[PDB]
mmCIF file with all atom_site columns, C-alpha atoms and ligand atoms in Angstrom:
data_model
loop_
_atom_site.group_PDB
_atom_site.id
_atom_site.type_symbol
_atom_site.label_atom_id
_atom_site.label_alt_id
_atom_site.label_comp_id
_atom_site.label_asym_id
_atom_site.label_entity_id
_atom_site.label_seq_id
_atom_site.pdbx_PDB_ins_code
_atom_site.Cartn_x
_atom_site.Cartn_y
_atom_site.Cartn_z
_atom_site.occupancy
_atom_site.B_iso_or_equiv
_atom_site.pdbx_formal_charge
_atom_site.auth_seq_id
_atom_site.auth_comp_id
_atom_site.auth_asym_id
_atom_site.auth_atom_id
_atom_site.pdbx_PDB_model_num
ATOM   1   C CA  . UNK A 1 1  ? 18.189  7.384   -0.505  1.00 0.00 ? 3   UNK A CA  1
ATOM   2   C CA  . UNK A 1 2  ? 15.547  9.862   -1.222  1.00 0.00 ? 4   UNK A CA  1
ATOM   3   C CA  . UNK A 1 3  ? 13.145  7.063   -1.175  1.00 0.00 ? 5   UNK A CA  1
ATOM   4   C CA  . UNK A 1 4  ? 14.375  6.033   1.984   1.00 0.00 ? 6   UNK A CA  1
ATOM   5   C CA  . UNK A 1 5  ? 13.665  9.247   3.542   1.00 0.00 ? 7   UNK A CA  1
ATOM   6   C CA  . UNK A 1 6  ? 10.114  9.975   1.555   1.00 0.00 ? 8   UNK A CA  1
ATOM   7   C CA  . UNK A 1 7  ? 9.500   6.558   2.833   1.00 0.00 ? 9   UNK A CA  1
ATOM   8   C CA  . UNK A 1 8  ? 10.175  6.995   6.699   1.00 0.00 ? 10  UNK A CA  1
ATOM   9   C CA  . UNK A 1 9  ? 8.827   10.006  6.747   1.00 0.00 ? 11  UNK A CA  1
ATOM   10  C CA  . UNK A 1 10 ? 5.557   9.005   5.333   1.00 0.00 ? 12  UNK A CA  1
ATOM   11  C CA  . UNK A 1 11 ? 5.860   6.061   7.795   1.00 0.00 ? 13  UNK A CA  1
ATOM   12  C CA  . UNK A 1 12 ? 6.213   8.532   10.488  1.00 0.00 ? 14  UNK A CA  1
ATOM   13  C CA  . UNK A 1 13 ? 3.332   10.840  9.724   1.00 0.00 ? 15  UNK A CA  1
ATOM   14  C CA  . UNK A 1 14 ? 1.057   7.923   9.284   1.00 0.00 ? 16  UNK A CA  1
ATOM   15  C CA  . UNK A 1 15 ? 2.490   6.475   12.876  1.00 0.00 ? 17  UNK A CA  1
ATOM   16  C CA  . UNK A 1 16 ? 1.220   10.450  14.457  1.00 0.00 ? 18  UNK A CA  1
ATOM   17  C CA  . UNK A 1 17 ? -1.649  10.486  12.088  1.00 0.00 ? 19  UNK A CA  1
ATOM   18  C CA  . UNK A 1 18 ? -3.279  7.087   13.546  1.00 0.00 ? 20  UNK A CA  1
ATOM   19  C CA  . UNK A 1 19 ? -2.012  7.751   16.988  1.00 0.00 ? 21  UNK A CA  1
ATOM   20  C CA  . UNK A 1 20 ? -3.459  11.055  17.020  1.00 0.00 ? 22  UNK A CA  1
ATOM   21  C CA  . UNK A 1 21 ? -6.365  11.386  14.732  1.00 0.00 ? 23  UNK A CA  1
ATOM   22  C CA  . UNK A 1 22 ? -9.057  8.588   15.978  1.00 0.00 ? 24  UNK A CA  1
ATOM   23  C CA  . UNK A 1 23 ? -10.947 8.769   12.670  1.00 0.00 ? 25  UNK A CA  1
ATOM   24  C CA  . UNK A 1 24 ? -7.436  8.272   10.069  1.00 0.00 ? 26  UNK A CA  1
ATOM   25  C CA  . UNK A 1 25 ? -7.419  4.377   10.206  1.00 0.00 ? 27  UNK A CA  1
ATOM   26  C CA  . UNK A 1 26 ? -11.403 3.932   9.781   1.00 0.00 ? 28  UNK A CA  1
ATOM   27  C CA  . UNK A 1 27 ? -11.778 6.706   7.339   1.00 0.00 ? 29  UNK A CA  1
ATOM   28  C CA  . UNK A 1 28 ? -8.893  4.776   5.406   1.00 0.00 ? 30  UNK A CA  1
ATOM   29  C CA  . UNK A 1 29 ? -9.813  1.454   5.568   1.00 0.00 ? 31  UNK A CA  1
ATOM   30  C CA  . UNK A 1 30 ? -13.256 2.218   4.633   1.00 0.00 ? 32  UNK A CA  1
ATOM   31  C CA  . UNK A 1 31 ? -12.124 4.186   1.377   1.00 0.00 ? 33  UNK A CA  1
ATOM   32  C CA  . UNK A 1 32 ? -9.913  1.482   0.565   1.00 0.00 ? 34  UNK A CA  1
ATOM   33  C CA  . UNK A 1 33 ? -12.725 -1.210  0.689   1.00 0.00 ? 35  UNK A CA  1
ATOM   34  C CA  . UNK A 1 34 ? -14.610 0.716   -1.115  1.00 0.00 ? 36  UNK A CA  1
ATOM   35  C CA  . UNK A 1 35 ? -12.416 0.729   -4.112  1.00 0.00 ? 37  UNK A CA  1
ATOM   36  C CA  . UNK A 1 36 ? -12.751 -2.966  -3.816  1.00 0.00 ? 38  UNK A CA  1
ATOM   37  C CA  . UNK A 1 37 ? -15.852 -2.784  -5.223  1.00 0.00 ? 39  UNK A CA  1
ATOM   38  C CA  . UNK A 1 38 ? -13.816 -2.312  -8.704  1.00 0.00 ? 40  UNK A CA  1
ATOM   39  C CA  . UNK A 1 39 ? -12.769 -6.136  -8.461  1.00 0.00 ? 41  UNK A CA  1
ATOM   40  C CA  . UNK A 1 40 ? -16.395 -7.091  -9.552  1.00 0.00 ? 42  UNK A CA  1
ATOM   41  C CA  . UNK A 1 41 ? -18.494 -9.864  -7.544  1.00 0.00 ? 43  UNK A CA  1
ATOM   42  C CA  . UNK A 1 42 ? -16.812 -12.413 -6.064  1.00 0.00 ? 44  UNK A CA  1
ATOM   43  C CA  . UNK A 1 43 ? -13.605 -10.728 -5.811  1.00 0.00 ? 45  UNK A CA  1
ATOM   44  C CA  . UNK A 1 44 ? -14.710 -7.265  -4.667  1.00 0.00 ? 46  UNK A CA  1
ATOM   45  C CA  . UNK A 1 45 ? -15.454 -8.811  -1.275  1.00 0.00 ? 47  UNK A CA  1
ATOM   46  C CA  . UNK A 1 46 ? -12.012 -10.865 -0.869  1.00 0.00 ? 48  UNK A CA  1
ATOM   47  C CA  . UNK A 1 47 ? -10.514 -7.078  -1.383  1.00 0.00 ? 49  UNK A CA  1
ATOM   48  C CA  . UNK A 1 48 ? -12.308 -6.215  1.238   1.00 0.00 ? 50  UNK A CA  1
ATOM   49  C CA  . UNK A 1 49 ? -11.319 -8.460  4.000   1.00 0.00 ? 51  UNK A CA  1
ATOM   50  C CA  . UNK A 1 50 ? -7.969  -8.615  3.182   1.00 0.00 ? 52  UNK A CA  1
ATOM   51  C CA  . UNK A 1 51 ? -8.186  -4.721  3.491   1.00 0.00 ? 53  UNK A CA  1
ATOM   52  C CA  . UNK A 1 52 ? -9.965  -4.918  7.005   1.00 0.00 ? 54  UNK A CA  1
ATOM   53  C CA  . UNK A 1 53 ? -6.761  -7.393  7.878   1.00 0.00 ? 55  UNK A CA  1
ATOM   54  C CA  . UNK A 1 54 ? -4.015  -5.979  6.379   1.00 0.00 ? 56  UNK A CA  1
ATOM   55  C CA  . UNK A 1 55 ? -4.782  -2.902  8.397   1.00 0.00 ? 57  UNK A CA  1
ATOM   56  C CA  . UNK A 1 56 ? -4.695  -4.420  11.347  1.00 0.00 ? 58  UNK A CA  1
ATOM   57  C CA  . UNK A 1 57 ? -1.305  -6.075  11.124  1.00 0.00 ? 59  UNK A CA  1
ATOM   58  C CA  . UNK A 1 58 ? 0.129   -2.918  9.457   1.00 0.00 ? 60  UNK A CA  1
ATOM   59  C CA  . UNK A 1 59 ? -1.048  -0.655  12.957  1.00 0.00 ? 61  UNK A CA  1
ATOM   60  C CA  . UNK A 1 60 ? 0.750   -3.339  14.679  1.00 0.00 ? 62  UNK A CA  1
ATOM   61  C CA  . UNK A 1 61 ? 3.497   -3.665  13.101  1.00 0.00 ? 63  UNK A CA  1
ATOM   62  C CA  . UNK A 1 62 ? 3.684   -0.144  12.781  1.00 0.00 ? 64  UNK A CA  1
ATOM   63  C CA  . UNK A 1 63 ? 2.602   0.790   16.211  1.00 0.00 ? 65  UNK A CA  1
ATOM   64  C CA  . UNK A 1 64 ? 5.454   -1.451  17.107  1.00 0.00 ? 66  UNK A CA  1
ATOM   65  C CA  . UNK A 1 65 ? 8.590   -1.227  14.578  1.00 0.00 ? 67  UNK A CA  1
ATOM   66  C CA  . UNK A 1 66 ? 10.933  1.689   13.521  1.00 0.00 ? 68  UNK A CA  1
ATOM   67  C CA  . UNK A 1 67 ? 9.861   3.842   10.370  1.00 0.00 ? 69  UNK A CA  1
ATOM   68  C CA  . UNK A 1 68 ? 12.934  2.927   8.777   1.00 0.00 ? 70  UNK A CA  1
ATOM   69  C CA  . UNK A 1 69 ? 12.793  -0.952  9.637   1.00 0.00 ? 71  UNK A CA  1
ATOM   70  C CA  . UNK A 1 70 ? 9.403   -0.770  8.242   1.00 0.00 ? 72  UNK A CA  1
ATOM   71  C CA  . UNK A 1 71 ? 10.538  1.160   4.888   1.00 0.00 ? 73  UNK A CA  1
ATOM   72  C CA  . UNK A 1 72 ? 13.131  -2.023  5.039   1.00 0.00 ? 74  UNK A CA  1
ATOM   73  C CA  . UNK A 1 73 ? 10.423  -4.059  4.790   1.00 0.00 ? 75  UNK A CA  1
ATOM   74  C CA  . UNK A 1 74 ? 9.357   -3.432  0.985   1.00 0.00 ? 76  UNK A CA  1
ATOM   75  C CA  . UNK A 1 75 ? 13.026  -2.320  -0.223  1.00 0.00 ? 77  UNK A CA  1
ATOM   76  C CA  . UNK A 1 76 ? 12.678  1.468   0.262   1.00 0.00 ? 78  UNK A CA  1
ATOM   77  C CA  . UNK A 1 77 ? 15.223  1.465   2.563   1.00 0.00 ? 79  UNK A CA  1
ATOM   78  C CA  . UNK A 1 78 ? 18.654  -0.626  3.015   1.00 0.00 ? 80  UNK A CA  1
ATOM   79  C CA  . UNK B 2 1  ? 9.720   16.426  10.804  1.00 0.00 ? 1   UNK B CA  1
ATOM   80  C CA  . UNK B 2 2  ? 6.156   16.348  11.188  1.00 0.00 ? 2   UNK B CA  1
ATOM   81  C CA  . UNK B 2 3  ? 4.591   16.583  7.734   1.00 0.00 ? 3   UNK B CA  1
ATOM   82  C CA  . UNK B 2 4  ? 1.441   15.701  5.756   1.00 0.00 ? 4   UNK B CA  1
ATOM   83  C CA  . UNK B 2 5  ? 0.557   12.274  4.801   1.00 0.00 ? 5   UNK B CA  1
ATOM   84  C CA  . UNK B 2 6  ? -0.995  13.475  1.586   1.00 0.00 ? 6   UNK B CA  1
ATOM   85  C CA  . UNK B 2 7  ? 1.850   15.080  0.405   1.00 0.00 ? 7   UNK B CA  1
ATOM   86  C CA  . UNK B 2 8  ? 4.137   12.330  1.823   1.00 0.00 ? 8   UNK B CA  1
ATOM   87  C CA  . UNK B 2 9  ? 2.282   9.980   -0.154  1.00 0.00 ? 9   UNK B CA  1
ATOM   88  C CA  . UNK B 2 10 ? 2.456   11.805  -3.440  1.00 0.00 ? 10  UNK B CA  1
ATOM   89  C CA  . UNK B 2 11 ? 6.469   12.727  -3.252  1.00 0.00 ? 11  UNK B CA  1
ATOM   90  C CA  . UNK B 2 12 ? 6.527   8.744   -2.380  1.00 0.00 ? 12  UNK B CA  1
ATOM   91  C CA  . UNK B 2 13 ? 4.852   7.575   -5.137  1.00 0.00 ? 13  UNK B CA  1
ATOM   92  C CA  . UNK B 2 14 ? 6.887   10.332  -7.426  1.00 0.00 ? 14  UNK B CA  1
ATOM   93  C CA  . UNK B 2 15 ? 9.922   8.777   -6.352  1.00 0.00 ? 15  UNK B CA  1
ATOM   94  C CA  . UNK B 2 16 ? 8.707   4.901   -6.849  1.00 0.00 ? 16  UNK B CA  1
ATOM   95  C CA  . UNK B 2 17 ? 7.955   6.120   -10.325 1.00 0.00 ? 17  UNK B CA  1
ATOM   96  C CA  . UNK B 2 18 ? 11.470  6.939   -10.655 1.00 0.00 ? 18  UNK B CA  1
ATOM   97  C CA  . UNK B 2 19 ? 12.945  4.198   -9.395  1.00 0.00 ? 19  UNK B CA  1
ATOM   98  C CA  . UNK B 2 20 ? 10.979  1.930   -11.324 1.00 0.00 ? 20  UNK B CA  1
ATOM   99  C CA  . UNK B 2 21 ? 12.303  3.552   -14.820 1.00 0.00 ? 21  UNK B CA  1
ATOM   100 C CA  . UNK B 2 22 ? 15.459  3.403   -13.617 1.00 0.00 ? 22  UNK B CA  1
ATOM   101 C CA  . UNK B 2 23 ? 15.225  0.089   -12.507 1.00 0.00 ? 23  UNK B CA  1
ATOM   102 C CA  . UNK B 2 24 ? 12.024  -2.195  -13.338 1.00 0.00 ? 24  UNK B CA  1
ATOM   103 C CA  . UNK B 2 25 ? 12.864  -4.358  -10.255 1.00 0.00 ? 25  UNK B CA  1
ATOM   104 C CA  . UNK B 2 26 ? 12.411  -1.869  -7.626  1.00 0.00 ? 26  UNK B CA  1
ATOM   105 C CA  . UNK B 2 27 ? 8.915   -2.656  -6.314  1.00 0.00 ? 27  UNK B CA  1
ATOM   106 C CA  . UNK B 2 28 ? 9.426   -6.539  -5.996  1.00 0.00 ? 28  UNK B CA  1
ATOM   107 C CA  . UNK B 2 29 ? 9.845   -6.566  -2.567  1.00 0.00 ? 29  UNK B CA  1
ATOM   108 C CA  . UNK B 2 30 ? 6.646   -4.657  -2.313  1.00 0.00 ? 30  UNK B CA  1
ATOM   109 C CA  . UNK B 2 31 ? 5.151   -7.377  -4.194  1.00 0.00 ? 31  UNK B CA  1
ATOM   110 C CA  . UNK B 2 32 ? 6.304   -9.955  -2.465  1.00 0.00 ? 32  UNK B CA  1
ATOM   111 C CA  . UNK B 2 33 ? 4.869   -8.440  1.079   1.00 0.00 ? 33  UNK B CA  1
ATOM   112 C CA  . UNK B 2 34 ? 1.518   -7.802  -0.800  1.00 0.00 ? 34  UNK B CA  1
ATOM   113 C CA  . UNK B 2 35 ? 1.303   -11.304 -1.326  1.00 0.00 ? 35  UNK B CA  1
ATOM   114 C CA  . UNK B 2 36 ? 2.653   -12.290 1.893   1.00 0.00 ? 36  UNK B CA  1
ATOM   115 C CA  . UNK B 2 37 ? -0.659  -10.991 3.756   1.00 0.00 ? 37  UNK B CA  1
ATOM   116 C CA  . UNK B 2 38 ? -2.783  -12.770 1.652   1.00 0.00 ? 38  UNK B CA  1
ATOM   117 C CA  . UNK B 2 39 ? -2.423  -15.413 4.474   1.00 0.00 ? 39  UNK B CA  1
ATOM   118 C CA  . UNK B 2 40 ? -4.015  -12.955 7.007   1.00 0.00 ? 40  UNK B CA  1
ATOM   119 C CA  . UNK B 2 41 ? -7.333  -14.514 5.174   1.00 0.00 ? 41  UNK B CA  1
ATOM   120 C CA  . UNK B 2 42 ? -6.790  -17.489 6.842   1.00 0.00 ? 42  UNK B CA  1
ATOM   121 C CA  . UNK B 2 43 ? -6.842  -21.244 4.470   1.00 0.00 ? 43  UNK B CA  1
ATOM   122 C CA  . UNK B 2 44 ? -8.499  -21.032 1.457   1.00 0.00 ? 44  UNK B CA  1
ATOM   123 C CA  . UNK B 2 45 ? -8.451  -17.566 0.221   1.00 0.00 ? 45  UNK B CA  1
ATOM   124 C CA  . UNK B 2 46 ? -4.883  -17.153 1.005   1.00 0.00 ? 46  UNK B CA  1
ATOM   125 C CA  . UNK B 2 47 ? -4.780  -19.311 -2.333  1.00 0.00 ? 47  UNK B CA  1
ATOM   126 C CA  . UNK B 2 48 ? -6.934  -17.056 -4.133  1.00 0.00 ? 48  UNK B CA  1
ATOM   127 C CA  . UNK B 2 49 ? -5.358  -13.963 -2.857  1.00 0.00 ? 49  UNK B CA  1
ATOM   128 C CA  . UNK B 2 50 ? -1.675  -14.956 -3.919  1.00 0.00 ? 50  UNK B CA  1
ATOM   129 C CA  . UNK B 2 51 ? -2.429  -16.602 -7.495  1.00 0.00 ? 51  UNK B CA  1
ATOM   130 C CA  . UNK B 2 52 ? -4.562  -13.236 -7.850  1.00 0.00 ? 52  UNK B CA  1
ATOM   131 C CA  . UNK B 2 53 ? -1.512  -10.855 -7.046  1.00 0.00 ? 53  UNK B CA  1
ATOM   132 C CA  . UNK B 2 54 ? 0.565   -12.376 -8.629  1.00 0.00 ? 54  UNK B CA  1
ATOM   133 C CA  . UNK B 2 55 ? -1.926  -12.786 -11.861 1.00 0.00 ? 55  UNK B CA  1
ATOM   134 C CA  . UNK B 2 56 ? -2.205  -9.232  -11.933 1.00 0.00 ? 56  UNK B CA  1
ATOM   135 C CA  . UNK B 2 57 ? 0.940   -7.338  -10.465 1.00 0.00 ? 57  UNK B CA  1
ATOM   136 C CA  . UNK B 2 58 ? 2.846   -6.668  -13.578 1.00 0.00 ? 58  UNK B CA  1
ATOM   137 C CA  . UNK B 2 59 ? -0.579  -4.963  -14.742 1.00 0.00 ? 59  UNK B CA  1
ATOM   138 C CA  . UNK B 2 60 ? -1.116  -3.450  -11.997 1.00 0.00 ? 60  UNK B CA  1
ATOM   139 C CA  . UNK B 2 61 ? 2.838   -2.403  -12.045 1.00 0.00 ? 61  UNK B CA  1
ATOM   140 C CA  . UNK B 2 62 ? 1.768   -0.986  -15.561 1.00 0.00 ? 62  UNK B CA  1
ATOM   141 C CA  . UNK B 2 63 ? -1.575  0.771   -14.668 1.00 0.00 ? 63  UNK B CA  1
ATOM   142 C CA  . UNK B 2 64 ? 0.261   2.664   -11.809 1.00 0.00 ? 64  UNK B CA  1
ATOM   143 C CA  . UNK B 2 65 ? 3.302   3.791   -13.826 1.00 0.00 ? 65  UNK B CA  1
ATOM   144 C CA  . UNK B 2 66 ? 0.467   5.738   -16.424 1.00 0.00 ? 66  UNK B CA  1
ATOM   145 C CA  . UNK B 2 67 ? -1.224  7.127   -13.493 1.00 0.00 ? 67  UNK B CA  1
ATOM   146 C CA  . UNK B 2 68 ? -0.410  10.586  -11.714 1.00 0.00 ? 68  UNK B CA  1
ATOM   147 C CA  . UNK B 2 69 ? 1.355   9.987   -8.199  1.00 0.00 ? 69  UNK B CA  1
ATOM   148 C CA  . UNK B 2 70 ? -1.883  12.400  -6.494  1.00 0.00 ? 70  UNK B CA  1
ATOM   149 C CA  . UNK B 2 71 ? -4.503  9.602   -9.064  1.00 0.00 ? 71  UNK B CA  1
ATOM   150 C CA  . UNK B 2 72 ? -3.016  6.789   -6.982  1.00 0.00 ? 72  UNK B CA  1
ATOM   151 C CA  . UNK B 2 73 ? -2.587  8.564   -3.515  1.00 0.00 ? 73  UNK B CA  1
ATOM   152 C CA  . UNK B 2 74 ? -5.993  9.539   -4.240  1.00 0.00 ? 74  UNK B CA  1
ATOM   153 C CA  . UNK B 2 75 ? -7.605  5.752   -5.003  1.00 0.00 ? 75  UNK B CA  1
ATOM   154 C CA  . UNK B 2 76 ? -5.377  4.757   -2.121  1.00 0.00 ? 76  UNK B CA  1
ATOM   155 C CA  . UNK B 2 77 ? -7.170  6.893   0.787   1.00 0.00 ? 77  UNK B CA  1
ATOM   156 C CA  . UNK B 2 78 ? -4.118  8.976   1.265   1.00 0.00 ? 78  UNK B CA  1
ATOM   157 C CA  . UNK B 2 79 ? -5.108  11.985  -0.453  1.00 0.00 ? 79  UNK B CA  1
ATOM   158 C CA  . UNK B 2 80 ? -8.190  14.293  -0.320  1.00 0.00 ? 80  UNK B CA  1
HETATM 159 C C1  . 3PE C 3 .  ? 2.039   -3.788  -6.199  1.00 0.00 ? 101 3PE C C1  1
HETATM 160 C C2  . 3PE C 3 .  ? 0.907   -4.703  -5.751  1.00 0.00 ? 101 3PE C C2  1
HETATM 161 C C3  . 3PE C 3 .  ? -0.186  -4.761  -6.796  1.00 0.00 ? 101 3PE C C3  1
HETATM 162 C C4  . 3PE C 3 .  ? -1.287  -5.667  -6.323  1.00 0.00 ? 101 3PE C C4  1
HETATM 163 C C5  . 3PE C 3 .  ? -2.220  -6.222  -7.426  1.00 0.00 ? 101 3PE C C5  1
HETATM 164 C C6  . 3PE C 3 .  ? -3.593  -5.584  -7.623  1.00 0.00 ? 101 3PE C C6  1
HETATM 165 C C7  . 3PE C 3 .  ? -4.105  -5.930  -9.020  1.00 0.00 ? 101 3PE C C7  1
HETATM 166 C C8  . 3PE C 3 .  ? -5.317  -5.172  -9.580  1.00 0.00 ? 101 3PE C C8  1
HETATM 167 C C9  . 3PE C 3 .  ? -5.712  -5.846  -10.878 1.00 0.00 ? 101 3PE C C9  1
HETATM 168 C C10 . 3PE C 3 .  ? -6.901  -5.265  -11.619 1.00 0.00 ? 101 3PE C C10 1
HETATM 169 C C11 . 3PE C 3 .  ? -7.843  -6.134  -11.406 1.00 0.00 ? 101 3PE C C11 1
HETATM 170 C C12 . 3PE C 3 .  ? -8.908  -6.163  -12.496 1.00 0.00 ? 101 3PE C C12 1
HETATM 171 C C13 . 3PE C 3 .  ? -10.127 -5.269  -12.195 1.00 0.00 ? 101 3PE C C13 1
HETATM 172 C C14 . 3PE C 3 .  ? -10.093 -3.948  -13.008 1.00 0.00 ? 101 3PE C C14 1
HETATM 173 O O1  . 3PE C 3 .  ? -10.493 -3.849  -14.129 1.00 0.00 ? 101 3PE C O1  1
HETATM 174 O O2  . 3PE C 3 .  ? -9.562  -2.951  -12.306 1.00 0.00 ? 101 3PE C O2  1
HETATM 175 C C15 . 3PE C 3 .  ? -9.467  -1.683  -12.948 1.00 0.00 ? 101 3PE C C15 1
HETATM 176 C C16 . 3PE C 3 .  ? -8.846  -0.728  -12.014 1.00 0.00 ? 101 3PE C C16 1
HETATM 177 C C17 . 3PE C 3 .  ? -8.301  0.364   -12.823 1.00 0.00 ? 101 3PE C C17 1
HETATM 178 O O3  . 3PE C 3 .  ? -8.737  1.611   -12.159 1.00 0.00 ? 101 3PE C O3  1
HETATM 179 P P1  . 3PE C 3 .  ? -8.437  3.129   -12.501 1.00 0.00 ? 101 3PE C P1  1
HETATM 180 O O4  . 3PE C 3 .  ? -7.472  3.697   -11.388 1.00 0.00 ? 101 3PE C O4  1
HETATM 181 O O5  . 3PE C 3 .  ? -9.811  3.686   -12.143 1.00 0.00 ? 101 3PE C O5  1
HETATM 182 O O6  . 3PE C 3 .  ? -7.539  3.123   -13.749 1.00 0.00 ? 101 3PE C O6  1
HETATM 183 C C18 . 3PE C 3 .  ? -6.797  4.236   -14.458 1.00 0.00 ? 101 3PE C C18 1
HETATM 184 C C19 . 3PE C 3 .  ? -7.251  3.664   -15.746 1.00 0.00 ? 101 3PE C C19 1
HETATM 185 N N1  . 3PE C 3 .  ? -8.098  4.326   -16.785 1.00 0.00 ? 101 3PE C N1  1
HETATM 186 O O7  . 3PE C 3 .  ? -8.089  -1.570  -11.103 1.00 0.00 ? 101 3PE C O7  1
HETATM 187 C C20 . 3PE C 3 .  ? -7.454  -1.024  -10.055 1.00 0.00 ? 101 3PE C C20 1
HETATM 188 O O8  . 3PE C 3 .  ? -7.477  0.149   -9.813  1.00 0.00 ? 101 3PE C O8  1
HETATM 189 C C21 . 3PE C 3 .  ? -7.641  -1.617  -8.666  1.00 0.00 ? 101 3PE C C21 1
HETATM 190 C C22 . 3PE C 3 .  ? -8.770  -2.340  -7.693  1.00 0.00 ? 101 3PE C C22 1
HETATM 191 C C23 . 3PE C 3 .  ? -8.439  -2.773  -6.280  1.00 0.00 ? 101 3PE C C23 1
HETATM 192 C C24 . 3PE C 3 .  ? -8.227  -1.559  -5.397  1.00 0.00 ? 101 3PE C C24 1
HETATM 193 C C25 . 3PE C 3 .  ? -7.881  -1.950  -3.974  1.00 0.00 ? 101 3PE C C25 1
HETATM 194 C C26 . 3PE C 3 .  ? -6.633  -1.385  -3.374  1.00 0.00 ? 101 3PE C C26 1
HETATM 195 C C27 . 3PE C 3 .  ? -6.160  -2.792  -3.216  1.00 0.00 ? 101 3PE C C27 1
HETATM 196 C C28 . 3PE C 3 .  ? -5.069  -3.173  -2.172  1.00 0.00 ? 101 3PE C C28 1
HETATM 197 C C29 . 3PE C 3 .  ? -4.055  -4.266  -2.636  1.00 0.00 ? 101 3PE C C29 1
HETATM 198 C C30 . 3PE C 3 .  ? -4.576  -5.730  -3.278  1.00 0.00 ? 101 3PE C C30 1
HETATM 199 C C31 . 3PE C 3 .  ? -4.813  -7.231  -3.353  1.00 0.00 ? 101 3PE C C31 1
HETATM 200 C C32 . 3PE C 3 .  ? -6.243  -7.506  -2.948  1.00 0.00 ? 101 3PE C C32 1
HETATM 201 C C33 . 3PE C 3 .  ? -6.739  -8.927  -2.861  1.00 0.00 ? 101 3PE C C33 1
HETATM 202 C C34 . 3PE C 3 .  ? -7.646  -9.684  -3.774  1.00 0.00 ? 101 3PE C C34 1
HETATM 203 C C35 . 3PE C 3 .  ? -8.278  -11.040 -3.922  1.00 0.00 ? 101 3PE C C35 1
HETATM 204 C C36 . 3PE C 3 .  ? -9.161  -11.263 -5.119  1.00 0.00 ? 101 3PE C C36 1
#
């Protein structure tokens, strides 16, 4: 309900975010791998590349679904 | 509305807290989709990555619900 909505509008603001700011997905990604580092060696790196492809598959699917279809996705919405 | 991911993310993770209390089931489907990716590793790690998820969700389920929505936001890239 609420969650739906918090959810497609974050969904929404990320979708204008990476289709208008052309340093939002890079800046991410990199803080994200970055926290990776927390996983120790060995792991740390794993983090990392399924960082660098789990953003490329979520601009995609993103770039091509509806906010709330997305939200559907992980049970925020429906 | 146009609004501000930061903020979005932080009201978000507010109301996950919430819905978790209410209901400890609420982020399985989350979870699950975590998981899911782990095959975007390609054969091998895909292993690694799914018996290490689901190793540590419920702690990670745990560490989240102590932390302050903005904390996690902020770990997450979303914030600052
Ligand atoms: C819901 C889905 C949950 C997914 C499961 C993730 C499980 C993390 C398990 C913790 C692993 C053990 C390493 C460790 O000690 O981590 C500590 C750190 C706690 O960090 P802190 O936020 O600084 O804590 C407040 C506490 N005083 O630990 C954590 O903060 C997190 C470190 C990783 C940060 C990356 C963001 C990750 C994206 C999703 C993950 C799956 C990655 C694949 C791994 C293959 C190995």
């Amino acid at each position: 309900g609420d969650v739906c909505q918090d959810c497609i509008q974050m969904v929404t603001d990320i979708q204008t975010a990476v289709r208008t700011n052309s340093t939002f997905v890079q800046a991410l990604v990199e803080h994200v791998k970055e926290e990776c580092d927390r996983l120790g060696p060995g792991m740390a790196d794993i983090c990392k590349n399924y960082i660098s492809q789990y953003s490329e598959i979520a601009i995609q699917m993103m770039m091509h679904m509806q906010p709330k279809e997305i939200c559907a996705l992980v049970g925020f919405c429906d």
